[PDB]
């Protein structure tokens, strides 16, 4: 296949990434960098962010969902579903609100597309109707995270693709908190795209610190398969 071939082959060996994030919660504004590598025939990523404005005022494991379904490790059986790669170099837009139970909610913005040989991820981020001393801005969630499918569907109008999903953080109390995913993607470029069969991607997340760095920052390794389609 022409196509598979085309976009697969931009994601064979291990790629760069870079990502960059504007946020603004409640008025609380901060900038994110983040660097690292994707390997999609392992569907493996390893990724470092720092906060560069200083504190972050959210927990991290919020903006985990945030900060790149292009390294998705799609089996041959299934590439004729994979959207993300398909989409590139010219990339795609990802927009998401995310709907905090009891809570705000962040709404994102961001290009993922090639930059010369790196691949980069550009994202904004608004959140609104955050409690002050709630789980968010009161920085109650704990600093891990659970794996959890994530249900991609075609969206025949937008020439794209639908994604929706819960993430369950776990709250330092022992509870937890719902954060409900609601994603659109469309590709930037007016090439051809691959538009999916239903199916879901399987991810499992680590969270972890890098002991050398006094930046507030949070180093993310993340793998990632593609199935539900026997």
């Not at 296949?1 to 409640?26: A, C, H, Q, R, Y």
């Not at 659109?184 to 795209?193: A, F, L, S």
């Not at 999916?196 to 991607?201: A, E, I, M, S, V």
């Amino acid at each position: 296949d022409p196509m598979v071939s085309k976009g697969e082959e931009l994601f064979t060996g291990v790629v760069p990434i870079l990502v960059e994030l504007d946020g603004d919660v409640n008025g609380h504004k901060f900038s994110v960098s983040g660097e690292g590598e994707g390997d999609a025939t392992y569907g493996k990523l390893t990724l470092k962010f720092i906060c560069t404005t200083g504190k972050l005022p959210v927990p991290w494991p919020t903006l985990v969902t945030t900060f790149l379904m292009c390294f998705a490790r799609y089996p041959d059986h299934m590439k004729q579903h994979d959207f993300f790669k398909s989409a590139m170099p010219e990339g795609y837009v990802q927009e998401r609100t995310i709907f905090f139970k009891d809570d705000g909610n962040y709404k994102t913005r961001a290009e993922v597309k090639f930059e010369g040989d790196t691949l980069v991820n550009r994202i904004e981020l608004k959140g609104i109707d955050f409690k002050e001393d709630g789980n968010i801005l009161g920085h109650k969630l704990e600093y891990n995270y659970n794996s959890h499918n994530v249900y991609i569907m075609a969206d025949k109008q937008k020439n794209g693709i639908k994604v929706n999903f819960k993430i369950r953080h776990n709250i330092e109390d022992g509870s937890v908190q719902l954060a409900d995913h609601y994603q659109q993607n469309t590709p930037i470029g007016d090439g051809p795209v691959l538009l999916p069969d239903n199916h879901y991607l399987s991810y499992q997340s680590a969270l972890s610190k890098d002991p050398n760095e006094k930046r507030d920052h949070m180093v993310l390794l993340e793998f990632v398969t593609a199935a539900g389609i026997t």
